[PDB]
Structures are given as structure tokens and as C-alpha cells.
Subunit: 297 residues, 4 copies
Amino acid sequence: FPIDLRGQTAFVAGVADSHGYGWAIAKHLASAGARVALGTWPPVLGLFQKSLQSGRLDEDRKLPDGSLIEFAGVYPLDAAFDKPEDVPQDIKDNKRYAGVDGYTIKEVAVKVKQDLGNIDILVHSLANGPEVTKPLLETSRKGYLAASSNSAYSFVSLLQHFGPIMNEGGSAVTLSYLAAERVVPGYGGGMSSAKAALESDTRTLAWEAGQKYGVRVNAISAGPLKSRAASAFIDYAIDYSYNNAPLRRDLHSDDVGGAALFLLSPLARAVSGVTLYVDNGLHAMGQAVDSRSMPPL
Amino acid sequence: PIDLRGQTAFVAGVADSHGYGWAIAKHLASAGARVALGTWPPVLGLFQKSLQSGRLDEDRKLPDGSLIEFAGVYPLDAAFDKPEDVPQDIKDNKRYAGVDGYTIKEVAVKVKQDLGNIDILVHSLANGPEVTKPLLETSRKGYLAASSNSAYSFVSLLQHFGPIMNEGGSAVTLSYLAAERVVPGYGGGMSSAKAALESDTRTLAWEAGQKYGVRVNAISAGPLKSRAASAISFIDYAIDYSYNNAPLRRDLHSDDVGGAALFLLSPLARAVSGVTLYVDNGLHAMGQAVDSRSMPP
Amino acid sequence: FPIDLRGQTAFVAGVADSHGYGWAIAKHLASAGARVALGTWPPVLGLFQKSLQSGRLDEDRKLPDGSLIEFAGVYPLDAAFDKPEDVPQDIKDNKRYAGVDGYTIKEVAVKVKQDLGNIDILVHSLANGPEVTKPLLETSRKGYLAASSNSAYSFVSLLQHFGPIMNEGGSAVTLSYLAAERVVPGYGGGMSSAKAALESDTRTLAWEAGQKYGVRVNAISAGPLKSRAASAISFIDYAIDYSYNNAPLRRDLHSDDVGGAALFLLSPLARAVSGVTLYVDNGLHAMGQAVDSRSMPP
Amino acid sequence: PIDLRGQTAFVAGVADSHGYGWAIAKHLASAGARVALGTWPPVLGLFQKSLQSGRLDEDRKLPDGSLIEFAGVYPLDAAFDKPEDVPQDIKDNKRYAGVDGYTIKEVAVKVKQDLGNIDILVHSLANGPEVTKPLLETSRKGYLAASSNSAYSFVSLLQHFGPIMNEGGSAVTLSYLAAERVVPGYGGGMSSAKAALESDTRTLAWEAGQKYGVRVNAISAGPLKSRAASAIFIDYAIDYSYNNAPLRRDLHSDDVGGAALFLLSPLARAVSGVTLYVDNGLHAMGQAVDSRSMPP
Ligand SMILES: NC(=O)c1ccc[n+]([C@@H]2O[C@H](COP(=O)([O-])OP(=O)(O)OC[C@H]3O[C@@H](n4cnc5c(N)ncnc54)[C@H](O)[C@@H]3O)[C@@H](O)[C@H]2O)c1
Ligand SMILES: NC(=O)c1ccc[n+]([C@@H]2O[C@H](COP(=O)([O-])OP(=O)(O)OC[C@H]3O[C@@H](n4cnc5c(N)ncnc54)[C@H](O)[C@@H]3O)[C@@H](O)[C@H]2O)c1
Ligand SMILES: NC(=O)c1ccc[n+]([C@@H]2O[C@H](COP(=O)([O-])OP(=O)(O)OC[C@H]3O[C@@H](n4cnc5c(N)ncnc54)[C@H](O)[C@@H]3O)[C@@H](O)[C@H]2O)c1
Ligand SMILES: NC(=O)c1ccc[n+]([C@@H]2O[C@H](COP(=O)([O-])OP(=O)(O)OC[C@H]3O[C@@H](n4cnc5c(N)ncnc54)[C@H](O)[C@@H]3O)[C@@H](O)[C@H]2O)c1
């Protein structure tokens, strides 16, 4: 009973495989009784649908009680585009987009409304920075703005188009990273700047959507995870966290899944505009404890 | 999703059903935990009488219709760490007659003997004898009493309970926005004590996370008409301000903080430590009041 | 002697009149002995140069000693463009841009290098959000990205192109606002998000430029000022009133107050200061509650 | 640009030339302020003698070649607000022999009598008797002594000097990053006291801004090999900062002296309630760059 989401509907944007935070969030929402629909980047939609229907993901879909999560629909969604007239001709003609239609944010919200009705829960678990491996001193304007469009404005647009079909008391969460607030070398390409914008937008939308729709908006600042996007260096980031955080333990995608479930549930009915660290306590440290400036183990 | 059956909690600072301590205890019991209370000795008799008379039956009532039951109600004076610290005047004070073994160290010993190791520790207690005084009119003695009762008491609770907490266990304390930004009327060095308390939450997250594998977090709550608050009408203005200026226009109930504390003290929060979680209808996010006399109605 | 900038050169990007923060920063730098060159948005360059030459600005140029500030040059600069190839044809042909050349960030840094040599001090005092009056729920992708391009990435680009000609121990400063950290109704169009990205880039560039160039990078989070930009959007008046009535220091905020704080951050007095956001706002940032709320008694 | 001639400063917590207090006092005097000092009474004799002997002549030398002179050096024990707070064993301690009128209230009265109103107030003093102990091993008595000596002392200084400060005057205190994020080894409840001190800086900025028109700010400083620091490791903290901060450079006491001069001057007339980091940019970092988890 403490977290009962039966009768509620969730839309989770940014799920293309079982290895990232988006999958873990969707799995927790389903285990708590929510109907869960997914938005998936259209070029990888076929591969994802194929891996679901083949039974290759059946282990990753397994719930504590032994049943398998089922999705209320898997919708193609490209969060770089708000409406059909924004999609350039090269994209519409791109073979990777052949045989999918209606994948702009506005069109997805219309389909969800038609197929499922009003929703209660909105998840933004997507990011893309084409110049992420470049330091900010070597990042182009185009790379920097692509990071911001894909990773920060996509959350604003999701709220603009889903907000109108969200029930009062409903909730939205996005994922961020400590680089928004403090310098993490290697998180380049204007991704740090985009995550800072995204946390600022979390607060501003908490105000705007709180007033207009009675909807809560929060962020989780997560620690490092070997997702498919991250492994495409991530190994060093995870070792650093393991060796320097208050809690000496592995960070699992389920750890963020569980924290998202809270922020998206009635337990969190007074919580809005927060950045909740889910990173084994690392955000609290003012000094590495394994620095070569200090004595060893 | 939150199953605390088999776990034991100790909630320090519960003397009635109107405060945040009671609401947290109630949420822990609804999720299956055994819950013991620590109560300031002069009001222990009154509280025990209220419980036993049935006066609190409505307040004890869960969703399923059972009433919460406590595994023990212990006298606890968080001003005193060991029996040697208790002055003769206190031992002889009539308000302490018929109660024994109420220092922090003694209570932790009794809990270990009666209940065994605990998983969950809650510090929901504060006392500022000069809280109505601005900081420019607060004496050293009043300021230090605020810090002793409200900040150091959390450190001492962790020092004495930490050794009897299971690995993976968790502690939470309660703070207020005045720790980070100026709230006129929260005086007597209570703002300073809450800043110390939030800093200690981080420091203890590191020390207790390393030493005990215990998580330590804080909730920064909004205004609530508790018995402590209504005795100081000012609490009424602070509530009105929040209602009129927060992202979520709704009443803030003690249950709202109870639900958030339940999360932080549960396995869903297994990667969360050292945080200050705002549970305040989003107010913390605002940079301007919206009902200022400087702006149009 | 405590702030002596004689022998140093500053470039101040985003000065088109005497009513904004950029002018006050330039004026303080000059009073401390720095040579000061300006970057000015090309469409308003003609009007600005005419004002300077006509004597209209002589009172605003006046220093405490009674001399008038002089600029080591006034350069057309459009901080939306990094290189000549980025400029679209409809801009090159726009009548507002007729008669000016070489105004991209890279070309301005080249001209500064050629005309003045290396610099010590860099100021970014420019922002532009075409949808600033729109709430975030009504702000388009195009307006949100223009706000970021003009107001946040422009600082990154300035450091990338001026960094190689900045002396070790040099210093850069930008201007932000509280809306980057907490919600201020009416600061819309993705400008709050752009200022958050700008403060984050201030820290990241402090690391990158501190390691590579030994250059310091800081931000000032300023209070409300009735500049030409602000009064063109009576909203700035309400924001000013709110600050006056709710801040720890009950006093008017003058552009010179930010000018003095920038002079510190850009001087050898600040040699150990980098990556900060310094509030210059009469203490308003420190407040957790308005004191003239209708929820409270008068 | 910064001209403090005609202004008067009181700098609490100067007992030698190696700490931040001295550097702030030196910068204030170079800018033309008259500077009085408050000195912990048990080291007052040694400090006065080192001044009068000429031993401090190099450290007193200004850029132009004159030596700073103080408007007076007052005994001050910031653990005590008024005479009746001082226990008998302190009054009788030989270290406090021959010194009188050293509670905060008394010093403020003497300053007003000797010098008149002041413009500038500096709090550069801390003491945590249990600083080497982790918080899980810190006693209540040790924790409260850290708070009394290091946080409340600033509140008391404003309460007693506030009434003799000119409108537009200014106060500054010194903090450290341990107030906001965990620094192992900064124990004894000193991290907690620095957090309370930063919070009090904000609350006093409001209270003293409204009542007196006085600005109140804090500098969060990096590690410095002062006498207090070398008595306690400080070498490891300094190395860490050198190897991990944006600016790879030594942090000198004059770096904080310069930043304090700014906060205490008319250039900062719109600045109040801030925590200004003067630490080579280290506060901005979210990761060490010489961690053994990463490659050399
Ligand atoms: N260490 C980490 O992995 C880490 C740390 C902190 C935060 N995060 C954040 O968590 C979120 C999830 O990341 P993950 O690493 O689990 O990645 P992931 O492997 O789930 O990849 C990111 C997802 O975004 C989707 N995506 C990218 N561009 C898209 C677009 N235009 N339209 C629709 N979908 C798009 C991708 O298809 C993919 O599903 C991200 O916002 C990321 O920044 C990740
Ligand atoms: N508006 C509010 O009520 C408000 C706002 C934010 C935070 N909080 C925080 O929530 C916590 C609980 O507050 P509440 O308002 O619900 O109070 P409450 O009415 O429960 O009173 C505080 C509790 O502390 C206990 N206590 C005080 N001194 C004690 C001692 N020496 N030993 C043992 N117990 C002692 C009291 O007996 C009482 O149970 C406090 O830390 C408070 O600062 C309250
Ligand atoms: N209340 C305020 O006025 C206020 C408050 C806080 C911060 N700020 C910040 O202070 C800074 C200066 O603002 P101001 O209000 O003093 O403005 P201002 O009137 O000087 O206008 C901003 C300047 O930016 C220049 N500019 C705009 N787009 C440009 C481009 N593409 N290329 C080159 N220059 C361009 C304009 O020509 C103008 O000189 C801005 O960053 C602003 O966001 C202002
Ligand atoms: N690494 C560092 O040295 C460091 C780092 C950050 C912040 N700080 C802060 O800077 C300030 C000055 O420290 P420093 O290391 O330059 O110190 P220091 O060596 O000047 O010693 C501290 C001073 O405080 C004085 N003092 C202590 N207790 C006193 C009392 N009860 N009454 C009056 N004076 C008393 C001492 O006599 C001494 O003058 C302190 O607040 C310190 O916490 C220092």
C-alpha cells in the first residue's frame, strides 16, 4: 500500500534497451501497478521492438513476483522535434526513419491521449551531446546548442505537450548529473551547461506547471552508470565514485529506479522543484579520499 | 515496493500527534516496521496517558483501519549524553520524578536490550529557548542551548545508536529553509543550529556511511502547526505565506513529511545519503514572492 | 595603489550606450588606469559612435578626477557568430549591418591582437532573449536556443578566441541573475536556463582556462537595473521596487555598484578568486522570504 | 579606487604575522584605514613585544616602504561577552595576569572611548579544542566550545560593535569549504561551527543591514600554514589544493587580505550576505584530478 500506482498511467521518454536508467524507472513504475508506455528514438525502435518480441529481454523484464512487465505501447519519439513542420527533409527521407511516422513530441502526446487517455506520470530519461568528448574550450556552437536542444529543451517541450493531458497531482522527473553544479573533467560538449539549464528548468517548470496544472516537477542527479550510451572512461568514473563516496557500494540502475518511483508517487505530494542526489553520497564530499596528494590505503 | 517488515525504528522526539515525529512514526508502522519512541521525560506521562486513554485513536488509524502500536515509549532527554552529565537540579526536578535512564547512552542500551539492533533512526526534535529573539538580541547561552538541543543531539544519537544499527540502515533529521536563507522570526540561533545540523548530516553521511554502512539524510520541511510551533499568531502567517507563494497551492500536512521520511528510511533510498530533501510544496525553489505589495495583486 | 591596472588592456563586449552594466564596468576599469576597448552590436554601432563623438556622452564619461574616459577602440561585434562562414546571407545584406565588416568573434579577436596586442581583462556584458516575455511553458525551441546562443555560448566563444591572447594571471567576468538559481516570474523565454548554463560554464571555464592559460573566470549575479535593454521590454520598475523593499540594504542599486565589484574580480586583488558567482544585489539573494508579502502584516 | 583614509577598522584575532588576520590588517592600513587589533590575552605580551622589538619590521613593510602602525592592540577573549561570564580560574590564570577589560562588550566600549565610531569590523578567529577528532568521537563540550569560540563570537562582535559602526560600514568573517561539503580531518564540530557562521553571516546581513545600514559578508578561504594550522596535516591540505584547484599557484595570506579589503570597501557597497571563495577556484571542482582511481 505505501506506493500503490494501480489505476495510474506513465509515459517514459528515452528507453531503447534494458541497460539504462529509463528502463529501471519503467520497471519500478510497473512493479508498483502503473500502466507504462515508452517513447523510443525512432532509428533504434525496430531493434528494441525486436528484442522485446523475441524474448531476449525476458530476464530484464522479470518482476519480484515473477511476472514480466508489459508496456501499454512503445511509441517512436524524437525529442529534437516538437511538431511535424520542424522535421527537415533529410530526416523524413533518412532510411533509419523509414516506416515510422508521428514521432514529434506534439504528435506523440496526441497519440497517447487518444490511445490511453490522461496520464499521471511523465519521465524524461534522454540526453544527447554530439561533442561530449570535447572540452568546452573546443566545443562548437552547433555542438553546444545540439546538447541543449536534445537534453534540456526536450524536457520543456515534453511538459508543454504532456502537461495539458496530465491529471492534477501528477508528476514529472528528469535526470541530471553533478557536472551541472561542479566541474567534472571529461563531461564536455556543453553537456554540463545543458544539465545546469535542465535543473534550472526543473525549478521554473515546478512553478509554472505547479500553478497551471497542479503538477510536480523534479530532478534526480544520478551517479555514473555503465549504460549503452555511457559505454559508447565510464569505468574510471565508476571507480572514482566507488573509492570516494560515503557509501562504498556499486550504483545500480534500480537505485535510481527506486528514487524516481518515490518522486513520481503520492508519497512525494509535497515535493517539487528538487534536485535529489542518488549517487551514494558523492555530492556531499569536498575532497577525494584517494588523492595522490594524500597518503595511500 | 516499500516493505519494512522485520525492521525496527527508533523515533526520537514524539510527545503528541501534532508534529512531524508522529507522522514519520505512523508511516514507518504502516509500512510494517516496529517503531519505538523517545519522549522528553517531563511530558512522558501526559503522552502515555493520551495513548492509553484512546484520545489518539483517530490519529493512530491507518488506511487499512488498524491502529499503529509502538514497541516501546522511552523517556529521552537529548540534552544529556550520559548519567554523569545530568545536574542535581534536574535529577531532583519534580518533572523528572518517577523516570530514570533517560540519557542518550542509556536509552540506546535499553533499546538494544529490549528490541535488539535497529535499522531506522529518526531525530525529530529541537528546542531554542530564545527563538523569538532576533540574532542581534540572542545571548550566548540561548544560542548554545539551541545548538546543544537541536544540532549536537543528532550527533550524539548517531554516536550511541550507530553501533546498534544494521548495515544498510538509515537516519533522518528535520531542518528548515532558515538554515540557508534568512527567514525573519526564526531567531535565537535556531537558524544557525539548523545550518549546523545540515552540515552534520553531510559529515555523518561520510563518517557513518564509512564506519557503519549507514545512510544519513535531512528533510527541510515547510511550516506546520505543531504544538511546539503554536506555543510560540506567527505560525499562521508562515503557513499563509507558504500557501500563497509556493509552486503547489495546497495545505502542507504532517503526513507529507511522513511519506518523504518513509522513502529516505527505506531500501528505495539505498543510494541516497547526505541530502537535504525539501518537502515544502516547492517553496525553496522560488526566488521572489508572488504576493508582494511591490507587485500588482 | 591597491587597484592599479596601468599597463593592462581590457576588452568589454556588449556596450552600446551609457545606461547598462557594461558601461559602468568599462568606466571603472579606465579609472584604475586600464586601456579599454569595446565590442558593440553592429546595428547600434553608428548611433553609439555618433553619441561618443557628439559630446552627448561627456557627462557619463566623467571620472572622479574630472578627466573623461577614452576607448582604445570601439569594435563591431555580433556575439551570435563565431566565424565569417556562420553569417547568413540575409544578415550580410541587412541594412542594419551595411558599412560594417569583420564583426564575428574570431575576427574581432584577430583585430584586437593586431591593434592592441595581448589583453589582461575580458568582460562579457551581453544577453539577448527574443522570447523573454514568454513563460517557459510558452517558449519555443527556436527562442530558447537563441537565448542560449546569444547569452551563454557567446561567453564560451569569447574565451575560446580571446584566451590565446590573454596574459597569464588575466581575468574574465560575465553577468548573470538570480533567476539562474531560483524562480523569478517574468524572466522567461529560456533566459533563466541560459543564465544557469552561463554560471555553469563560468565554473567549467575557470577549470579549463585556469589550467591552460592561468586565467581566472568569474560571474557577477547582479540585481535589477533600468538599462536600455531592461526598459525596452512597467516590469523593470516592479523588479526594482521589489528589491528596494525586500533586500537587507535598503538603497538604490546603481550600475556603478556592479562596476566596482567587476573591477575587483578583474584586478590582482582577486588573484585567488575563480569560478565564483558573486552577488551584487544589496543582499537580496540571502533572503528566504519577502518582508512586504500581503500574507504578512504591514 | 579603494581609498580608506578617514575610516577606522577593528580586526579581531591577530596574534602574529602568519595568519589571515595580519594580512587583512596590512591591506586595510595600506589603503589608509586606521587599524586597531584584538588579541587573545594569553598571547598579548608576546605579540606586543615582537612588535616593539622590531622583529616584525619586515612583515610590517608596505609597498611604498613605510611600516604599518596600529591605532591600538586590545586584549580580547571572544569566548566572553561580559565580565560576569569570565570564570574565576580564567581571572586567576597567570596567562591573563596583568590584563583587564578583555570581554567583547568591554573592548567595544574601550574602542568607542579611544577611537570613536568605526567603519570596518573583521572577525578572524576560531578555536575548536577537539578539531582532530571525527564528529563520531566529538563530545558535547568540545562541539559547543567550537561553536562558542568560532560562530557565536561573530554574532557577539556585531551585537557590541554594531551600535558604534557608521552607516555604510562593513564586517567580514572567515569560513572554510568544510561548512558546505565534507573535508576529512576538519573535526571537533568545527565544520558545524563554520556552517552556523555562514548562516549567521546571512542572518546578520539582514538584521544589521536593516538596523545599522551595515554590510556583513564571509570569505571561504583555502588552506594556509598559519601558526594555528601548523600546531594541529596542513601540508597535505595545501598539496591537495595545489594539485587539484583550477589555478595551480600557492595560496598566500595576502590573497585573502586583498579580497577582504574589497568586501570592506566602498567598491562593495551593494554586496552583503555573500560567501566569497578565495581558494584558487577549488570550491568549483566536482572531482579530484589526481585521484588514484584515474591515470597519472
Ligand atoms: N552515468 C550515466 O549513465 C549517467 C549519469 C547521470 C545522469 N545520466 C542521465 O540519465 C539519463 C539516461 O541516460 P543513460 O546513460 O541511462 O542512457 P541511455 O543508454 O538510456 O541513452 C540515453 C537515451 O536517450 C535516448 N535519446 C537520445 N536522443 C534522443 C532523442 N532525440 N529522442 C528520443 N530519445 C533520445 C537514447 O535513444 C537513449 O535511450 C540521461 O539524461 C543521462 O544524461 C546518466
Ligand atoms: N513548522 C514547523 O513545525 C517546522 C518546520 C520545519 C522544521 N521543523 C522541525 O521538525 C522537528 C519536529 O518539530 P515539530 O514542529 O513537529 O515539533 P513538536 O511539536 O514535535 O516539538 C518538538 C519535539 O522535540 C521534543 N524535544 C524538545 N527538546 C527535547 C529534548 N531535550 N529531549 C527529547 N525531546 C525533546 C519535544 O518534546 C517535541 O516532541 C524539529 O526539528 C523542527 O525544527 C518544524
Ligand atoms: N536588470 C538588469 O538590467 C540585469 C539584471 C541582471 C543581470 N543583467 C545582465 O547584465 C548584462 C548587461 O545587461 P544590461 O541590462 O546592462 O543591458 P544593455 O542595455 O547593455 O544591453 C545588453 C547589451 O548586449 C548587447 N548585445 C545583445 N545581443 C548582442 C549580440 N548578439 N552581439 C553583441 N552584443 C549584443 C546589446 O547591444 C547591449 O549592449 C546582461 O548579461 C544582463 O543579462 C542585467
Ligand atoms: N588553513 C587555514 O589557516 C584556514 C583555512 C580556512 C579558514 N581559516 C580561518 O581563518 C581565520 C584565521 O585563522 P588562521 O589560521 O589565519 O589563524 P591564526 O593562526 O591567526 O589563529 C587563529 C586566531 O584566533 C585567535 N583566537 C582563538 N581563540 C580566541 C579567543 N577565544 N579570543 C580571541 N582570539 C582568539 C588566536 O589567538 C589566533 O590569533 C579562522 O577563522 C580560520 O578558521 C583558516
